[PDB]
Amino acid sequence: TLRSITSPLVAHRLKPIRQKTKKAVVSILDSEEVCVELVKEYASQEYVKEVLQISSDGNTITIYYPNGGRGFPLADRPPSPTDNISRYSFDNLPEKYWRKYQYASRFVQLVRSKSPKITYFTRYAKCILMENSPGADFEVWFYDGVKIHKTEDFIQVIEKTGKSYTLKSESEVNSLKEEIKMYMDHANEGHRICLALESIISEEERKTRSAPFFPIIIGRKP
Amino acid sequence: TLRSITSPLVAHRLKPIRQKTKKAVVSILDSEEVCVELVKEYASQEYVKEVLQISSDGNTITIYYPNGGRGFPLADRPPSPTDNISRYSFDNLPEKYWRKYQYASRFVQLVRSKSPKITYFTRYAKCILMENSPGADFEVWFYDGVKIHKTEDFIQVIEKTGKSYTLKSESEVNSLKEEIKMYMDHANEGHRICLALESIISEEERKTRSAPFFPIIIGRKP
Ligand SMILES: [Cl-]
Ligand SMILES: [Cl-]
Ligand SMILES: [Cl-]
Ligand SMILES: [Cl-]
Ligand SMILES: [Cl-]
Ligand SMILES: [Cl-]
């Protein structure tokens, strides 16, 4: 089952963006739909030959072949579909499209990892909870120039010149320079607070509202 | 009793600012202390002869007379105190100082009423809960050009041309134009949401004891 392999992408709250690779051009549209344009090379120009159009909730996939299946010149936006389409639920998408769905799925997931959900200004730092929940990335931009980038798999640290190093196990973190273990105590507190605030706002989001409660920016730089 | 005329001012979260009249200068300092410099003019130059230094919570008043009471030329910041001071709790400030305290008190009150606590972007409007709690001003900037400004004694409405009118009682509110009642029901929802969000966030702020949770910016303009 595809739902075993990955979860449906969710592009809610994500800003429009276009990524051009060798394999595809993946776009998050203004409607939060995600499109995968499979581009073919007929030198010099590239043609859009196939399009996967994925719904913002990730559960509807519309596949079509623009220009009668002959192709469209790759443009700034994807070609809109015609009544000639094939369409599937996520749970019903044939495997032949799984790899292409995941192009979108992954891109969305990457964009979420760079999309601020909650920004929290503290005395020493600017905290940013990202959108790739759960286990979202957590960035910490201290004003002195120190940068801490939290992940699920690791914790990055960038010192004031560019001394970059990646910390993994807690046993490796304890072994860090002792003026730094305090920076983490800040960064971890922000993280706890941001997570704390995310929870409370989501709860309030569930009840009657009129617009999303995310993103949120809390406070200001001094 | 002074507690009858005002509440101790509150300058938390308020941005630095300086206002000059002929008789005095009020500043909200970067520390959120509020100063009243009483100014007198001696041959073209103006001197600070008296200073009231009020705590950010409005409950401590330190009063002094710079340069021996002869004065210091009015500068960009108030003259700092010396060993020679008198200092009072709010409830203990002598009447001789009440009108000068009220000078700081009124100014702080004007600033809060113009200082955003919660900014909330909707599909149709930009809502801003001000800081003059309780009964804070709540202004609503619809994108189409309609403006609604909720206030303590009344509700102003500005239509797309400049049709300004004041509603003070339900009798004028029910009697409102029927399509305007639509703008108002939004505005009223925004207020409830913003008030709801204010309460839930302050509560979590109390437990955390770290950088403030206000102001916030919720969402984005479409
Ligand atoms: Cl291009
Ligand atoms: Cl349709
Ligand atoms: Cl098919
Ligand atoms: Cl959510
Ligand atoms: Cl929503
Ligand atoms: Cl002292």
Domains, chain B, ranges and CATH? 1-115 (3.30.1120.120), 116-222 (3.30.1120.130)
Å from CA of B97 to ligand 6 middle: 20
Query: Looking at the complex, does the CB of residue A211 fall below 8 Å from at least one CB of chain B?
Result: yes
First-to-final CA distance of chain A: 51
Distance from C-alpha of A34 to C-alpha of A54, rounded to nearest angstrom? 5
| Contact list, A210 vs chain B (CB under 8 Å) | 122-123, 186, 189-190, 193
Burial of A109 (0-12, 13-18, 19+ CB in 10 A): middle
Is residue A108 within 8 Å of residue A34, measured between CB atoms?
Answer: yes
The full length of chain B comes to: 222
Interface contact B211, partner A, CB < 8 A = yes
Closest residue by Cα to residue A184 from A140, A220, A131: A140
Output phi, psi for B158, to 5 deg. Answer: -120, 120
Asked if residues A35 and A54 have their Cβ atoms less than 8 Å apart, the reply is: yes
A216 in reach of chain B (CB within 8 A): yes
CA angle A215, A128, B114 (to 5 degrees): 55
Is B189's Cβ below 8 Å from some Cβ in A? Answer: yes
C-alpha triplet A166, A169, A172: angle, nearest 5°: 70
- C-alpha A158/C-alpha B185 separation (Å) is 50
CA distance B13 to B57: 11
Q: Which residues of A touch B214 (CB under 8 A)?
A: 218-219
Q: Give backbone dihedrals phi and psi of A109, rounded to 5 degrees, phi first.
A: -65, -35
A209 touches chain B (CB under 8 A): yes
Q: How close is the Cα of A54 to the center of ligand 5, in Å?
A: 18
Distance from CA of B221 to the nearest CA of A (A): 10
Nearest-Cα distance to chain B for A70, in Å, is 36
Token code pair at residue A76: 């700034």
- 3-state SS assignment for residue B26: strand
3-state secondary structure of A9: coil
Task: Using CB atoms within 10 Å of the CB of residue A92, give its burial: 0 to 12 exposed, 13 to 18 middle, 19+ buried.
Answer: exposed
Give me ligand 2 centre to Cα A126, in Å: 44
Task: List b or e across A57-87, with b for residues whose CB sees 16 or more CB atoms inside 10 angstroms.
Answer: ebbbbbbbbbeeeebbebeeebbeeeeeeee
Work out whether strand B24-28 and strand B17-20 pair parallel, antiparallel, or are unpaired: antiparallel
Residues 6+ apart with CB under 8 A from A134: none
Lookup: tokens for A199:
């929870």
On whether any CB of chain B is under 8 Å from the CB of A122, the answer is yes
Closest Cα of chain B to A2: distance in Å?
Answer: 33
Our CA-based measurement puts residue B115 at a distance from the nearest CA of chain A, in whole angstroms, of: 13
B50 alpha-carbon distance from chain centroid: 24
**Residue closest to B62 by CA, chosen among B76, B77, B79:** B79
State how far the Cα of B127 lies from the Cα of A209, in Å rounded to an integer. 13
How many whole angstroms from B60 Cα to the centroid of ligand 6? 12
How far apart (Å, rounded) are the C-alpha atoms in residues A36 and A100? Answer: 7
User: For residue A130, what is the enclosing H or E element?
Assistant: strand A125-130
Nearest to A210 among B122, B210, B220 (CB): B122
> Rounded to 5 degrees, what angle do the CA atoms A172, A178, A184 make?
70
Angle between helices B180-208 and A181-206 (to 10 degrees): 150
**Beta carbons of B125 and B140 less than 8 angstroms apart:** yes
CA-CA distance, A115 to A215, in Å (whole number)? Answer: 9
Q: Is-contact B94 B2, C-beta < 8 A?
A: no
Closest listed ligand to the CA of A56: 5
- Report the SS3 class of residue A163: coil
Cβ proximity of B29 and B16 under 8 Å: yes
CA–CA separation, B204 and B209 (whole Å): 9
Q: Identify how the structure was determined.
A: X-ray
Q: Are A112 and A100 in contact (CB under 8 A)?
A: no
How far is Cα A95 from Cα B31, in angstroms, rounded to an integer? 62
Tell me if chain A has a CB within 8 Å of the CB of B212: yes
**Chain A positions in Cβ-Cβ contact with residue B140 (cut-off 8 Å):** none
**Spatial contact of A86 and A100, defined as CB atoms under 8 Å apart:** no
Question: Rounded to whole angstroms, what are the CA distances from A129 to A34, A51, B147?
Answer: 23, 33, 33
Please tell me the distance in Å from A142's CA to the nearest CA on chain B. 14
Interface touch A212/B197, C-beta < 8 Å: no
Residue type, A11: A
Taking Cα atoms as reference points, which of B96, B81, B93 lies closest to residue B51?
B81
- Taking Cα atoms as reference points, which of B7, B24, B14, B20 lies closest to residue B59? B7
User: How far, in Å, CA of A111 to CA of A125, rounded?
Assistant: 23
* Residue A111 and residue A17 in contact, taking contact as beta carbons nearer than 8 Å: yes
| Among candidates B186, B190, B211 on the partner chain, residue whose Cβ is nearest the Cβ of A122 | B211
Under an 8 A CB cutoff, do A219 and B219 touch?
Answer: no
Resolution in angstroms comes to 2.6
Of A122, A213, A220, the CB nearest to B218: A213
